[PDB]
Design a protein around this ligand. Structure first.
Ligand SMILES: Nc1nc2c(ncn2[C@@H]2O[C@H](COP(=O)(O)OP(=O)(O)OP(=O)(O)O)[C@@H](O)[C@H]2O)c(=O)[nH]1
Ligand SMILES: Nc1nc2c(ncn2[C@@H]2O[C@H](COP(=O)(O)OP(=O)(O)O)[C@@H](O)[C@H]2O)c(=O)[nH]1
Ligand SMILES: O=C1c2ccccc2CCC[C@@H]1Cc1c[nH]c2cc(Cl)ccc12
Ligand SMILES: [Ca+2]
Ligand SMILES: [Ca+2]
Ligand SMILES: [Mg+2]
Ligand SMILES: [Mg+2]
Ligand SMILES: [Mg+2]
Lengths: 62, 438, 243, 420
């Protein structure tokens, strides 16, 4: 069990004790994905206003 | 000297950040109004505490911190709390409405509208730094802001500071304090998206700290203040070496060099002793041997799991108080004969030790008794994978029926990002099993 | 009223433990994958030990010891004895055939002994009084033979060595599998297989982590399990000797 | 986090008035709109339901009817002058217990005027959560026009939360035979255009009043008293500060794993000078007798549950009793939504009680209620009986076959998860 690299100072000490040795995506791509999601939203919202407009027409027809 | 910037994201991140900067001030002697009598270099410095504080011409000491919540109620209490004068208004950032426990609402919908402002306020701190080392990020896995906005901030920080180190402090979700049935979902998403962008991450399971507050502080129903004051002690030990003179873990590159041989396997388990109640009428002070031993008891770890059934890749002892190297190696020698402690072959069985003679500081009137010596162990066991399996299994239960997915899709996510995030986690569990078992 | 699940459907022993548990009117069985249980009778393999002990307000108990396979897989056992200091040992064959065994007469017949060992959550070691040599000879018989044929008893000639070998294996791995301070607890039933030589010396062959019993004993011993391993942890409204 | 309250029709306005009486007494507001309470928890989230005035407080409430009778009653009742007079919106001809008159003719003439008050209340909201509607499904105004409003509001405010307290008809306590028609038409709307619906069955309200409160002839006022207590308890977390920020979107995210299965069973305890022990609250809360939807929760499985305890009690005992009842009844919670039972606590109890509990459950037993409605509908619709009241307002049989079909689908979807 060997001690090593002992360092002292007024605040304390540090050392290493051994017991045995051994045997990125770019800003453009983020932008793309962050906007392919917004498109998917706006599509879903646009489907909603479409179904709602049909309901207005049925309301009128009745 | 080299500066460090802390970023607190979400409710968990912010409130835990309160507890840490409070503890820091008490430790460096900085009073709530930003003054630090013992700093004689008025208005500047490159002392070790200056890694976490800048200084004003008026002698104010200013946290190199950025707080960020998608909703204002929490960062407001800081704006009007005991430490208001501490922060520049522009370090506290809030939006209007939160992510409603929804990763996708924090990442895609509501996050995309405040990211550039947050990066701008962070840049304003990076320009005040002669040689910035990197960032410490505090967040929950489970909240919608905590997971989704953070993973977006972590993607852009890699881009804007490719050369900088990023450490995490991550609150892992516990049902006996939790907030949402969807936290396993948020948890996996934000791990998948932040993995490549993190150098080292310390997981604090709310279950572990909750049981510690009850068993060891005799608190029947622990609060966020209880939990967070105990969490701040553990973070303070981990960061003491950035704010104090010493030779172990002096910069953020040393955490990953000393604790992370494998990039993906960068989640070291933390264990802390001793936790003693302030209202324990009679308390016998524990010894170097007794507290180093408690470091191998699961009931003291930040994550419950059984290190006896895994392999070690690195072990780091960090003492605070009345400790000298000789008591430490007589404790290790004893423990080595009584405990199963197996390292991986390609790595040396051994310990890195660090001692700071100042004993731990306690918030006056808190729940932690003052002690004469304490220790925090940081070890990289494959045992921590037990926590990924728990979380991945809860994710498999809900996602097998697509429960709650429609809340994510309806914010713009595709269902594939779920199975992509879960296949990444399935590989991560496979890595751990490689390193760990025969 | 306690709760328990069953995840090894074809285990003779715990099939009888489940059945006797219901009959108390104080346990109900849930479905394999329902996590809100007191007691897991678990798979033989890949048992998920990492998910036990994380259910608030549930004391959880499982009928296996994580790590015990170190004793029950031949290659591992051998590595264990050769390598563990607590074992050096004189009762385990040279390993990397016992050409002179003891023979029952009349028949010049070979045999091996199976002993049943329950280890509870406190790590008490319980040896079942009834061992077995349908080509099955039990302990009352075997004792009388030894007295008549050799002028000795089963206790003195064989059982001392057996209780010694059981103690030594299980105290060896104790600090590696003990659940004393864990967040879930373990018990486990073992089966030890011995052979005796002409010199009346006992040897260890294998340790079985999922043993079956012998028919006429599937009842005394299954009740002894509920009494010592289960109801000890989940009280309600001796056949073992402690080692 | 402001909430816009809307109440429609006879039932919707009578129950809505009781609700504003109850919570106004909780928040210390008198019938004049002046606060006279003794705590600031009463005022910390007061803005969620009240606008500020001589800084008086006025409910963010819109009162809607196709005839004047019930709203004159509200305006003449205890807290009647508390409401903003611009916010009474009404016609004169009524809707004749007729869904079509509410949705297509009489109500179509009046809806835009309601949406002008909705728009006024919304635009001056700092951060609008969404809308809460009180109405019955068995008549014409609250049912037909109520669901028309919900469709107009989703179009103008597609990103706010829509929440209803919906009273479901019942042959026991019944105004007309066409209730099953009106209700089936309305459930089709509600399945698509709300986020959360509190299903309140008048049958359960009657049984509770008879078989438990020991009232031999319950009035509608005794029935609404139960609805008022439940509305108060179901909104406690929105109106008082808790260790959790409770808001309508977080409730929906955590309560609704599939978008159409958002119909919740409410419950209350207690339904007296001895306060209840926390064990009793927990027993009663989950008792079918205490639940307001007339479904046997033991005939299905809880997908999600939310419980709120009101009063000063042992949070430790609370958790201990919640964990007990789950592990005593796990055959009734789905195992594929981990940790699907949430618990809140609030120190301020409701008037006249030191301990109360409110239960919100998303159980697949709710299908019994939609089956009951579907059976009463098919019984008439297969002889096309009473249909001329609707074909005379412009509707075709097709729209009926469609709503019959969409609600039998709902029953299939609920049955799909009770066996998964
Ligand atoms: N330890 C600890 N955990 C917390 C704290 N606050 C919240 N949590 C936990 O964090 C998870 C929820 O995350 P929050 O931080 O509340 O979420 P958030 O980021 O604000 O997200 P939104 O509010 O959804 O925008 C749950 O597991 C909570 O138990 C805290 O102060 N300390
Ligand atoms: N609980 C309750 N139910 C009511 C009340 N008034 C009417 N109902 C029920 O409401 C349904 C139809 O009533 P109503 O609301 O009067 O019709 P509207 O005016 O056309 O909306 C029937 O199912 C009635 O039983 C009430 O005050 N309380
Ligand atoms: O905001 C809320 C709310 C809103 C109105 C009335 C009562 C409540 C209860 C308090 C909590 C919920 C939100 C919620 C967070 N996590 C959960 C888990 C489950 Cl199973 C169910 C719900 C929630
Ligand atoms: Ca200085
Ligand atoms: Ca007209
Ligand atoms: Mg938040
Ligand atoms: Mg054999
Ligand atoms: Mg009526």
């Amino acid at each position: 069990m060997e001690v090593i690299e002992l360092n002292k100072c007024t605040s304390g000490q540090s050392f290493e004790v051994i017991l045995k040795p051994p045997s990125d995506p770019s800003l453009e791509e983020i932008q793309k994905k962050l906007e392919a999601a917004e498109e998917r939203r706006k599509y879903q919202e646009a489907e909603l206003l479409k179904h709602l407009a049909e309901k207005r027409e049925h309301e009128r027809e009745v | 000297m080299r500066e460090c910037i802390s970023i607190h994201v979400g409710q968990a991140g912010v409130q835990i950040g309160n507890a840490c900067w409070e503890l820091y001030c008490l430790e460096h002697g900085i009073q709530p109004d930003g003054q630090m009598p013992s700093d004689k270099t008025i208005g500047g410095g490159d002392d070790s505490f200056n890694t976490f504080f800048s200084e004003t011409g008026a002698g104010k000491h200013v946290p190199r911190a950025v707080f960020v919540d998608l909703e204002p109620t929490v960062i407001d209490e800081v704006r009007t709390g005991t430490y208001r004068q501490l922060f520049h208004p522009e370090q506290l950032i809030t939006g209007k409405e939160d992510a409603a426990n929804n990763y996708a609402r924090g990442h895609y919908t509501i996050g995309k509208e405040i990211i550039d402002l947050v990066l701008d306020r962070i840049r304003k701190l990076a320009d005040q730094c002669t040689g910035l080392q990197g960032f410490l990020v505090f967040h929950s896995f489970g909240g919608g802001t905590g997971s989704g906005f953070t993973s977006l901030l972590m993607e852009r920080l890699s881009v804007d500071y490719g050369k900088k180190s990023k450490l995490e402090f991550s609150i892992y979700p516990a049902p006996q304090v939790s907030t949402a049935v969807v936290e396993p979902y948020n948890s996996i998403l934000t791990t998948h998206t932040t993995l490549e962008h993190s150098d080292c991450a310390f997981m604090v399971d709310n279950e572990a700290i909750y049981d510690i507050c009850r068993r060891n502080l005799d608190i029947e129903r622990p609060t966020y203040t209880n939990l967070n004051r105990l969490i701040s002690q553990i973070v303070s030990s981990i960061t003491a070496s950035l704010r104090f003179d010493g030779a172990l873990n002096v910069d953020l590159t040393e955490f990953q060099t000393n604790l992370v041989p494998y990039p993906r396997i960068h989640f070291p388990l933390a264990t802390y002793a001793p936790v003693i109640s302030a209202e324990k009428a009679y308390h016998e002070q524990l010894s170097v041997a007794e507290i180093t031993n408690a470091c191998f008891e699961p009931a003291n770890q930040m994550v419950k799991c059984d290190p006896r059934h895994g392999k070690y890749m690195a072990c780091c002892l960090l003492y605070r108080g009345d400790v000298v190297p000789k008591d430490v190696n007589a404790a290790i020698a004893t423990i080595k004969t009584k405990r199963s402690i197996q390292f991986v072959d390609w790595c040396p069985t051994g310990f890195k030790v660090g001692i700071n003679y100042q004993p731990p500081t306690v918030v006056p009137g808190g729940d932690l008794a003052k002690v004469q010596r304490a220790v925090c162990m940081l070890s990289n066991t494959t045992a921590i994978a037990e926590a990924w399996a728990r979380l991945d299994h809860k994710f498999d239960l809900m996602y097998a029926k697509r429960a709650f997915v429609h809340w994510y899709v309806g914010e713009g996510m595709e269902e594939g990002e779920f199975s992509e995030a879960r296949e990444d986690m399935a590989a991560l569990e496979k890595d751990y099993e490689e390193v760990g078992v025969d | 009223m306690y709760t328990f699940v069953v995840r090894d459907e074809n285990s003779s022993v715990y099939a009888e433990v489940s059945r006797l548990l219901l009959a108390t009117g104080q346990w109900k069985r849930l479905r394999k994958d329902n996590p809100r249980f007191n007691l897991m009778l678990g798979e033989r393999n890949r048992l998920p030990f990492g998910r036990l002990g994380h259910e608030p307000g549930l004391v959880q108990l499982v009928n296996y010891y994580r790590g015990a396979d170190k004793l029950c897989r031949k290659a591992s056992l051998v590595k264990l004895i050769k390598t563990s200091p607590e074992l050096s040992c004189t009762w385990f064959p040279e390993s990397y055939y016992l050409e002179k065994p003891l023979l029952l007469e009349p028949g010049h017949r070979k045999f091996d002994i199976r002993s049943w060992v329950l280890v509870d959550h406190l790590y008490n070691i319980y040896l079942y009084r009834e061992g077995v040599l349908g080509n099955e000879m039990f302990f009352e018989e075997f004792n009388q033979y030894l007295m008549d044929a050799l002028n000795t008893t089963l206790e003195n000639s064989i059982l001392l060595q057996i209780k010694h070998i059981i103690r030594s294996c299980l105290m060896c791995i104790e600090p590696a599998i003990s659940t004393k301070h864990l967040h879930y607890q373990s018990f486990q039933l073992f089966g030890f297989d011995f052979m005796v030589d002409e010199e009346l010396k006992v040897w260890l062959i294998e340790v079985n982590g999922a043993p079956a019993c012998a028919q006429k004993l599937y009842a005394e011993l299954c009740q002894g399990i509920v009494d010592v391993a289960i109801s000890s942890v989940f009280p309600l409204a001796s056949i073992f000797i402690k080692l | 986090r402001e909430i816009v309250h809307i109440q429609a029709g006879q039932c919707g306005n009578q129950i809505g008035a009781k609700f504003w009486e109850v919570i106004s007494d909780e928040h210390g507001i008198d019938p004049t709109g002046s606060y006279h309470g003794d705590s600031d928890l009463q005022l910390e989230r007061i803005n969620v339901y009240y606008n500020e005035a001589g800084n008086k407080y006025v409910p963010r409430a819109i009162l809607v009817d196709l005839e004047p009778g019930t709203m004159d009653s509200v305006r003449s009742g205890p807290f009647g002058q508390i409401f903003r007079p611009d916010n009474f919106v009404f016609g004169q001809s009524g809707a004749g217990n007729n869904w079509a008159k509410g949705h297509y003719t009489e109500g179509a003439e009046l809806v835009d005027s309601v949406l002008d008050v909705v728009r006024k209340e919304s635009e001056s909201c700092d951060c609008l959560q969404g809308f809460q509607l009180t109405h019955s499904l068995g008549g014409g105004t609250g049912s037909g026009m109520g669901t028309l409003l919900i469709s107009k509001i989703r179009e103008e405010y597609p990103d706010r939360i829509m929440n209803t307290f919906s009273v479901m008809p019942s042959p026991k306590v019944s105004d007309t035979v066409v209730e099953p028609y009106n209700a089936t038409l309305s459930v089709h709307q509600l399945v698509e255009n709300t986020d959360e619906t509190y299903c309140i069955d008048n049958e359960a309200l009657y049984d509770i009043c008879f078989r438990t409160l020991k009232l031999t002839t319950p009035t509608y006022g005794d029935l609404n008293h139960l609805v008022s207590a439940t509305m108060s308890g179901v909104t406690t977390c929105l109106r008082f500060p808790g260790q959790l920020n409770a808001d309508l979107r977080k409730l929906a995210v955590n309560m609704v794993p599939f978008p159409r299965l958002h119909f919740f069973m409410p419950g209350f305890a207690p339904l007296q000078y001895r306060a209840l022990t926390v064990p009793e609250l927990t027993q009663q809360m989950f008792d079918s007798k205490n639940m307001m939807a007339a479904c046997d929760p033991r005939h299905g499985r809880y997908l999600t549950v939310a419980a709120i305890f009101r009063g000063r009690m042992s949070m430790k005992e609370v958790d201990e009793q919640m964990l007990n009842v789950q592990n005593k009844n796990s055959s009734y919670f789905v195992e594929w939504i981990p940790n699907n039972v949430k618990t809140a606590v609030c120190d301020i109890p409701p008037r006249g009680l030191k301990m109360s509990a409110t239960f919100i459950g998303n159980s697949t037993a709710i299908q019994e209620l939609f089956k009951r409605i579907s059976e009463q509908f098919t019984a008439m619709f297969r002889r096309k009986a009473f249909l001329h009241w609707y074909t005379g307002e412009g509707m075709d049989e097709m729209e009926f076959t469609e709503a019959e079909s969409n609600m039998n689908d709902l029953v299939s979807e609920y049955q799909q998860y009770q066996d998964a």
